[PDB]
């Protein structure tokens, strides 16, 4: 299943990403429900913006792991998971654009 362009690696951890208050506290409460990283074929675009790249990962991931992005409540899970997966799909860099 995980060979989607957006499957959640989901190893069961709390990561090291500074969310700010409400996000980080909600993460600590139920973190096993969230990803570790993504498998969006790394990134092979010699000309991609962040708002192109990580966006494409998200337009993929929303359809990868649909059962997560259909919670009945879980408010802060959006503001965590959307930011979480954005960092997971931003990181350091891809290639053409670099530090």
UniProtKB/Swiss-Prot annotation:
Its main location: membrane. One of its GO terms (biological process) is intracellular copper ion homeostasis. It is a lipid-anchor; GPI-anchor. N-glycosylated. N-glycosylated at two distinct sites. Glycans are attached at residues 47, 59. The keyword Nuclease does not apply. Residues 1-99 are annotated as: Globular. It is found in: Cell membrane. One of its GO terms (cellular component) is extracellular region. GO terms for molecular function: copper ion binding. Coiled coil: none annotated. Disulfide bonds join 43-94, 57-89. The keyword Metal-binding applies. Keywords: Amyloid, Cell membrane, Copper, Disulfide bond, Fertilization, Glycoprotein, GPI-anchor, Lipoprotein, Membrane, Metal-binding, Prion, Signal. Required for normal acrosome reaction and for normal male fertility. Can bind Cu(2+). Belongs to the prion family. This is Prion-like protein doppel. It comes from Homo sapiens (Human).
